[PDB]
Ligand binder design. Structure first.
Ligand SMILES: Nc1ncnc2c1ncn2[C@@H]1O[C@H](COP(=O)(O)OP(=O)(O)O)[C@@H](O)[C@H]1O
Ligand SMILES: CS(=O)(=O)Nc1cccc(NC(=O)c2cc(-c3ccccc3)cs2)c1
Ligand SMILES: [Mg+2]
Length: 857
């Protein structure tokens, strides 16, 4: 157990709290008659009910479908479709006529398996409202089909009547495919091709254009409707991305009401009968090309071929008699929960002895096991520049480094790709003869009850291993090396659990309400495979708690704002609260930074003197974050090269800071348009060492945003979670003790970003908060016996009943103000003296000094 923490609160402040509560006429819960029966201090403190179909209209010559606005300037404002159609045709005919590098690219395009199905695909699309283009990965579904459709309208003098939307499940795919199709038309993105992912877009031209966006972005732009679009291409439907599954529900209603629209669903070689039945038994256009017979090998075959020996229910124990005693004895020593890196090294050295030039595609879960495998290889001098080109391929690296996987290598060098499941069905790498398959997947499991994020390394499906096996037989007779026992393969599920089954639904719930599609549960019931009940109940509960929905489950003015903001609704509300306190910029910066990896280059180690200094004396990763932005935004003043020098010298990832800043500008814009004043979102300079009340309030609002992630510090890295369970301070934290010197925290309480479950519970991105900040924002339920208070039945404080119930009343007073503010956001300019008195009182108890703490000593 742990003793109740004493909160040394001054007599002056305890009166001020009581005064404000009295001035606001707040119904404070009085003390208990006796101990043993404690009282809850929590103060509990609508629109008419409505199904609806998202409206549709075809392309128009004086309309820009991407900016969702009229063209009332330039030549295209008055110009007729016939002129635009001829102007765009003549331009393309002349380009193909001249550019010899473009002619060569078109000659590569015309060799892709999909090419010979061009006639049938175009014929199918023209006849039917919806079709499915099923076909193996590498035929050219993604890159060619949109072009075929566009060219067919250009060549047949109807370029003005074509505007294609193409949805991709991943961010990287939307941007990469746009860059790829642009190159294939001898352009950069911004002409015939463009992309619109989250916090980054390059808009294409208003006519005869393709938009490669993510589904999340499309849904956020449907508020007006699908106006000025001829075709909607939903790509990679087989991956079962939750937002894609959701869009198919929307699009089916759209097809039914507006059958003139054209929907093209594109899928790998899977059972597409589910989607066919869903879209009124639509046609399935089959696409195929040359494939070679790939030899399948499992963990037994690999260990035996390489004569491998590991260092110092389990399916590695189960092994057939048709194998060797040492093979069976060797395999048995391998832990299934880890990937054998030394075996992959042994498999690469075996691939050499076969004397058949070809690239090796190594499938791994995430950026960690790719980083680990890469580091492991470069240690051995054999896997050097002269003999091996080892290229990593995951989401969070520059596109320059990702483009290099397609580049040919000089003969004598082997191209080894250490990739995630991006290279499973989403992209095809050429000259791939060998595939080393870990047989694992990285999925984000989230259990709401304990607020546990688990980036788990779970088993892949049979369908996954069959698709990964097929990545070898596109050049010549290939080999696939599965690192799973022949027993384990039998125990694998046929298909991966679709995201709809195992993902929070509150972001989708808001989308449903914004687009006015009716009831959350009513709409999600129409899904191709509806989500489980508790996930819909959990979503409806989450949005009610935030006052995003009311008792009638109808969207509130607050809920409308949260829907438009593309971040966690809890961070969206934290930003709204931030605006009220005139710290809107800082909270927008913090909110943005959650969407990107850490700007620090720590390399999975403890932080150095340089990175730790950004934290100041606040014992906060979030203060460190805000501080690198202050330092970075100051360094940018001296041009681009000075920015690159600052980043290199301070070991910072420049691409991360730029994308995060860009995101902050876009979040800020959505608040401005929602009615919030300009001068409550200004970049206010701050100190991370000296007294700063604006930073005090940011950390108070942080506590709200990351709730229910709070923890208690015991000794060294060992911390106590909200479940009363043991957890660790993450190595990458500033609050992680460097070497043996134990940190003297002025408070044991920490709010934090993610509650990562691995071997043990690891709290990442930690910020120290006072016990007053704990009671104000980082708690829901509070019970008092008169002397002790019980915060969410996990930790106890020794604080005056009066102060604890008053701090609990401010929380309710703030919620009430947030509701009033969201009805008319411009009221934060001039507030009632009474409202500013409770804001000033929150500002007061946000201070360290308020809890008798001086961070400078
Ligand atoms: N960035 C790229 N660099 C080189 N080749 C590429 C690139 N993107 C796609 N390709 C090639 O284009 C062809 C079609 O790919 P794609 O349209 O993604 O196929 P799919 O039908 O599987 O979606 C493949 O041969 C692939 O190797
Ligand atoms: C609604 S639709 O489905 O018919 N068309 C559609 C589809 C997908 C995406 C977008 N639009 C965008 O992605 C973006 C637009 C702007 C923008 C807007 C105004 C001024 C300046 C920039 C930035 S991103 C439209
Ligand atoms: Mg594809």
């Amino acid at each position: 157990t742990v003793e109740p923490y004493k909160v040394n609160l001054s007599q002056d402040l305890e009166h001020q709290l009581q005064n404000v509560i009295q001035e606001l006429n707040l119904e404070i819960v009085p003390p208990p008659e006796d101990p043993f029966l404690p009282v809850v201090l929590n103060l509990g403190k609508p629109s008419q009910r409505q199904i609806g179909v998202v409206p549709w209209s075809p392309p128009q010559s004086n309309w820009n479908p991407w900016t969702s606005s009229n063209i009332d300037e330039g030549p295209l404002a008055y110009a007729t479709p016939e002129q635009i159609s001829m102007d765009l045709k003549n331009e393309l005919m002349y380009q193909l006529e001249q550019d010899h590098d473009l002619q060569a690219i078109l000659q590569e395009r015309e060799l892709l398996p999909v090419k010979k199905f061009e006639s049938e695909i175009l014929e199918a699309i023209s006849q039917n409202s919806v079709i499915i283009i099923r076909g193996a990965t590498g035929c050219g579904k993604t890159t060619q089909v949109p072009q075929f459709i566009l060219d067919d309208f250009i060549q047949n003098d109807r370029a003005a009547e074509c505007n294609i939307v193409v949805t991709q499940p991943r961010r990287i795919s939307a941007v990469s495919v746009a860059e790829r199709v642009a190159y294939e038309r001898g352009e950069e993105p911004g002409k015939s091709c463009g992309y619109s992912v989250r916090f980054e877009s390059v808009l294409p031209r208003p006519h005869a254009s393709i938009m490669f966006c993510t589904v999340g972005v499309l849904l956020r732009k449907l508020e007006a409707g699908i106006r000025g679009i001829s075709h909607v291409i939903v790509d990679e439907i087989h991956e079962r991305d939750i937002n894609t599954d959701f869009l198919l529900v929307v699009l089916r209603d759209v097809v039914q009401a507006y059958p003139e629209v054209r929907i093209v669903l594109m899928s790998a070689t899977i059972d597409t009968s589910m989607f066919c039945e869903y879209f009124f038994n639509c046609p399935i256009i089959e696409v195929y090309g040359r494939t070679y017979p790939v030899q399948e090998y499992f963990l037994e075959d690999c260990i035996q071929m390489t004569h491998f020996v590991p260092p110092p229910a389990n399916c590695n124990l189960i092994c057939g008699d048709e194998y060797g005693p040492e093979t069976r004895m060797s395999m048995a020593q391998l832990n299934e929960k880890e990937t054998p890196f030394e075996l992959i090294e042994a498999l690469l050295k075996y691939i050499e002895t076969l004397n058949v030039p070809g690239a090796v595609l190594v499938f791994l879960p995430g950026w960690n096991l790719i980083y680990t495998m890469q580091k492991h290889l470069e240690m051995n001098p054999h896997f050097g520049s002269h003999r091996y080109q080892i290229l990593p391929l995951h989401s969070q690296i520059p596109r320059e480094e990702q483009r290099k996987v397609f580049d040919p290598v000089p003969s004598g060098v082997t191209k080894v790709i250490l990739s995630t499941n991006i290279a499973e069905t989403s992209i095809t790498i050429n000259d791939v003869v060998y595939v080393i398959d870990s047989c694992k997947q990285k999925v984000k499991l989230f259990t709401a009850h304990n607020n546990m994020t688990n980036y788990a390394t779970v088993w892949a499906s049979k369908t996954n291993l069959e698709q990964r096996k097929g990545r070898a037989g596109r050049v010549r007779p290939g080999f696939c090396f599965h690192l799973c026992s022949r027993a384990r393969f039998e125990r694998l599920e046929t298909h991966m659990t679709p995201e709809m089954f195992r993902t929070p639904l509150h972001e989708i719930a808001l989308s449903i309400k914004l687009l006015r599609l009716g009831g959350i549960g009513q709409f999600l019931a129409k899904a191709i495979e509806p989500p489980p009940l508790d996930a819909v109940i959990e979503a409806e509960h989450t949005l009610r708690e935030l006052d995003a929905l009311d008792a009638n489950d109808e969207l509130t003015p607050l809920g409308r704002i949260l829907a438009k903001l593309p971040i966690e609704p809890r961070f969206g509300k934290m930003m709204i609260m931030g605006c009220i306190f005139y710290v809107g910029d800082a909270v927008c910066t913090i909110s943005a930074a959650t969407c990107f990896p850490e700007p620090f280059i720590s390399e999975g180690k403890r932080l150095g003197y340089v990175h730790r200094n950004f934290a100041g004396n606040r014992f906060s990763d979030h203060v460190a974050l805000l501080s690198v932005f202050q330092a970075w935004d100051d360094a940018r003043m001296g041009g681009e090269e000075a920015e690159i020098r600052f980043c290199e010298h301070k070991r910072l990832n420049m691409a991360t800071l730029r994308m995060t800043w860009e995101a902050k500008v876009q979040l800020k814009e959505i608040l401005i348009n929602s009615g919030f004043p300009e001068d409550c979102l200004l970049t206010q300079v701050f100190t991370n060492t000296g007294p700063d009340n604006n930073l005090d309030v940011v950390i108070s609002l942080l506590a709200f945003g990351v709730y229910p992630n709070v923890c208690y510090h015991k000794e060294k890295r060992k911390i106590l979670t909200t479940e009363g369970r043991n957890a660790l301070i993450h190595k990458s934290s500033v609050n992680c003790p460097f070497s043996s010197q134990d940190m003297k925290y002025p408070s044991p309480f920490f709010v934090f970003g993610e509650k990562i479950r691995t071997r043990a519970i690891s709290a990442k991105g930690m910020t120290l908060v006072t016990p007053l900040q704990l009671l104000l924002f980082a708690s829901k339920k509070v019970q008092s016996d008169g002397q002790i208070v019980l915060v969410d039945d996990w930790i106890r404080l020794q604080i005056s009943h009066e102060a604890a119930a008053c701090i609990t009343a401010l929380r309710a007073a703030m919620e009430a103000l947030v509701v009033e503010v969201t009805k008319q956001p411009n009221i934060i300019s001039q507030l009632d003296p009474v409202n500013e008195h409770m804001l000033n009182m929150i500002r007061q108890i946000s201070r360290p000094s308020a809890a008798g703490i001086n961070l400078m000593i």
